[PDB]
Design a binder for this molecule. Structure first.
Ligand SMILES: [Mg+2]
Ligand SMILES: [Mg+2]
Lengths: 304, 301
């Protein structure tokens, strides 16, 4: 028993981290096969950051302007190109530690592990949820840019995120591995803010199931509700609307505990109106929304 | 910006995880050089759990009774000895992925990462602290015995914990890598109870210093306290007493923020008295005790 915010083992990703230098700017890169991926803002200076022309800045830059460091070994850049907001550096040698991988674009509410790096060296790992406003509440200091987010399916690593910048409120913004931003952000040094965040409702429900599986059952009641009744209450408290897709996804948890999703929604509806009244759930005084139903099943219902 | 509970990258440890089998029991082992370390209870059957005579069980075993598997490769056991509650299986092939390592015995309040494994295969990594009652609030299912706890300092992996059992209250007990248990626990199925868990005070103080560094000042007050008066109040809230050692340890954070340890102690005293009042500190509605003074400096500098 027990329940923790668990990250995927990072070993397959650690062997892909490199340091990328251009001028007085050092950030992290992802070395897969003979290509190194990093944020395109590495070619920028303090001047060409307020209004940068990346198209103009890349044509004047040459291969020798990129210092790629894989641990102690130096990698010779034999080409470069841009794909949206990511820079692709073609290198002379293929990464022997390249795992089985794929580039995936995740949806808000989904979770992933982040390997936080500084100068190409992995220093920490933590579990994340993509917020409904398209930001991530991570922990990043300067030099973390180009740190990646991933999920492990079986032997296949799926890269879903690359860090680009921090927003003034402390939240973080980035792209998928094809350079497409998550959210209405630009990779320019300008005033930009995230939209209003909302609670990922289906994730809170999965967590209430994990609590029931671990012996915390005080919030259960005899009552049931409907999707229409629940959503009207949820929208008032800044919660994501619950769809029938969300209900079907909670199925294996509903079957294993003996508490139907609509039965559990009445407990959640009761917690939103009345509060937690001095009590905790899984050692938390706030409703947790950074565990998906799959995370709960993988951690509890199954060994892996 | 941002404050997250972070674990160490588990890569160096993943390459050391193996699967050990004795009879019908399968658990995890730690493969370093030509030795596989694992919980000694792997040699027990159903009727051996209440009162096992390990010396008796081990003498009846030969090397070919232990099946060691590193992925798809079978490892040949050429020797076996017991050291406290850990079994040491000498194998013929040394681990090429052996990192630079040390075995360290930690004290309550110290944090470490746990690589949870099943059938010699890594499943997940998480960060936790050694509770003052010598248990860990981990996340383990059946078959996770042999999963290890570690810290990484530069290129060096410090192995500090090996998982042996879950206590009836849901908490976890284990040994250091020399087989000595943390706490008054034994590897027997008899009724064992962990002492009362208390809050790690020095860790909550370090976390209040991190909140001040990240801008949060709402909980500060114009009061200062004596160490004796603080401990008299804290004991009533199930908080560990603070010692002069804890005060010296907090020195760098005190000098960095300009807030004396006993002045931050008086703010903690008021938080215990009033509650959060709806407010949060570093995104939390409870006082956090699983970040050490060393972890706060490492993440906020
Ligand atoms: Mg109900
Ligand atoms: Mg004060």
């Amino acid at each position: 028993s027990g329940f923790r915010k668990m990250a995927f083992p990072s070993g397959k990703v650690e062997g892909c981290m490199v340091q990328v230098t251009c001028g007085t700017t050092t950030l992290n890169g992802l070395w897969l096969d003979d290509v190194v991926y990093c944020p395109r803002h590495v070619i920028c200076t303090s001047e060409d950051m307020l209004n940068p022309n990346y198209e103009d800045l890349l044509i004047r830059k040459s291969n020798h302007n990129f210092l790629v460091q894989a641990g102690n070994v130096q990698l010779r850049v034999i080409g470069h190109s841009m794909q949206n907001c990511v820079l692709k550096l073609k290198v002379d040698t293929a990464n022997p530690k390249t795992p089985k991988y794929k580039f995936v674009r995740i949806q808000p509410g989904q979770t992933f592990s982040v390997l936080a790096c500084y100068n190409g060296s992995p220093s920490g790992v933590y579990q994340c949820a993509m917020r409904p406003n398209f930001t991530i509440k991570g922990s990043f200091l300067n030099g973390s840019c180009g740190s990646v987010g991933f999920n492990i399916d079986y032997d296949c690593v799926s890269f879903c995120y690359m860090h680009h910048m921090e927003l003034p409120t402390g939240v973080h913004a980035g792209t998928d591995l094809e350079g497409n931003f998550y959210g209405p952000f630009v990779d320019r040094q300008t005033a930009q803010a995230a939209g209003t965040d909302t609670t990922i409702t289906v994730n809170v429900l999965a967590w209430l199931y994990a609590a029931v599986i671990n012996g915390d059952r005080w919030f259960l009641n005899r009552f049931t509700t409907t999707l229409n009744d629940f959503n009207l209450v949820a929208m008032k408290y800044n919660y994501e609307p619950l769809t029938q897709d969300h209900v079907d996804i909670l199925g294996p948890l509903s079957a294993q505990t003996g508490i139907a999703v609509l039965d559990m929604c009445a407990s959640l509806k009761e917690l939103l109106q009345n509060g937690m009244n001095g009590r905790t759930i899984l050692g938390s005084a706030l409703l947790e929304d950074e565990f998906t139903p799959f995370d709960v099943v993988r951690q509890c219902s199954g060994v892996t």
